[PDB]
From a paper:
The axon initial segment (AIS) has characteristically dense clustering of voltage-gated sodium channels (Nav), cell adhesion molecule Neurofascin 186 (Nfasc), and neuronal scaffold protein Ankyrin-G (AnkG) in neurons, which facilitates generation of an action potential and maintenance of axonal polarity. Among these proteins, Ankyrin-G (AnkG) is considered as the master organizer that directs the recruitment of diverse components to the AIS. In addition, AnkG is also well known to interact with Neurofascin 186 (Nfasc), a cell adhesion molecule that is essential for AIS integrity. Here, we report the high-resolution crystal structure of the AnkG ankyrin repeat (ANK repeat) domain in complex with its binding site in the Nfasc cytoplasmic tail that shows, in conjunction with binding affinity assays with serial truncation variants, the molecular basis of AnkG–Nfasc binding.
In agreement with our understanding of ankyrin structure, the Nfasc ABD peptide extended into the inner groove formed by the ANK repeats. However, in contrast with the antiparallel orientation (N-terminal to C-terminal binding) observed in other ANK repeats–target complex structures reported for ankyrin family proteins (Nav1.2-AnkB, AnkR-AnkB, etc.), the AnkG–Nfasc complex adopted an unexpected parallel binding orientation (i.e., N-terminal to N-terminal binding between Nfasc and ANK repeats). Although we used the Nfasc 1187 to 1214 segment for crystallization, only the Nfasc 1198 to 1214 region could be clearly traced in the electron density map. Unexpectedly, we found that instead of the more easily formed antiparallel intramolecular interaction, the fused Nfasc ABD bound to another AnkG molecule from the neighboring asymmetric unit, forming an intermolecular interaction. Thus, we believed that the parallel binding orientation was not induced by the short covalent linkage but represented the native binding mode. We next examined the specific interactions between residues responsible for their binding and found that the AnkG–Nfasc interface is mainly mediated by hydrophobic and hydrogen bonding interactions. In particular, F1202 from Nfasc inserts into a hydrophobic pocket formed by I277, V282, and C315 from AnkG. Similarly, F1208, another aromatic residue from Nfasc, occupies the hydrophobic groove formed by AnkG residues L343, L376, and V381. Among these, we found that the E1204 sidechain from Nfasc forms hydrogen bonds with T339 and N341 in AnkG, while the main chain of E1204 forms another hydrogen bond with the sidechain of D308 from AnkG. In our solved crystal structure, the corresponding Ser and Tyr residues of Nfasc form 2 hydrogen bonds with H384 from AnkG.
Residue numbers in the entry: 251 to 496
The structure:
Amino acid sequence: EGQFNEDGSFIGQYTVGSLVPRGSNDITPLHVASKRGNANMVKLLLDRGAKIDAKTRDGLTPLHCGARSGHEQVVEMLLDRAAPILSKTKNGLSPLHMATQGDHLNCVQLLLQHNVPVDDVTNDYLTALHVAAHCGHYKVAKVLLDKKANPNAKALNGFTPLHIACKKNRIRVMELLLKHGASIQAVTESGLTPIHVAAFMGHVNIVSQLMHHGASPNTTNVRGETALHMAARSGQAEVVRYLVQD
């Protein structure tokens, strides 16, 4: 009865890789076609019935791969053939998080136009706006905020996109969030404000900018520390010099 199956040793050997065996054929031809952005290959494979929601070991669907690399035509083609828009990877990343991570304005808009909830969260409770603040993607953050992403949304450890822009020294995103209503006095799980976070990592320009917008330097965390205590505990001499000289 095996005579009525596909046989041979070449099926699946030329999808990815170059003579080095891979443990499982989790990466399908549709994943490869979407990562490359070849809409002709995608239409070919979808017409032959390729599984549109197949997942890799990490849980990436073809829609995740197309959005991660910003291949707008592939993404629309997958969405028009009903690829699940909210499919998540093992750590909770939707295709919108991956489009945001690659600073792909076209694919972020395209997913938002297909009714992806703008504040869909990962397992760390990161929205796409959190990810844009982490990467410093000003353009995409502005798109998410225009579609009403919550600028005070909290991750698991209580960080808002503003806390993250301050931890990662993203001055443009920090300024954009403040213009769009991110609370400068928002507090994390351990009582830290955005100026505590910038002062600890030594981001002097962010500390001064937060000071211009009314950040209180005398606020204290759960452990009783002000921003100057944390700048002194970490040794950021220029943050220390700025706080005392002001």
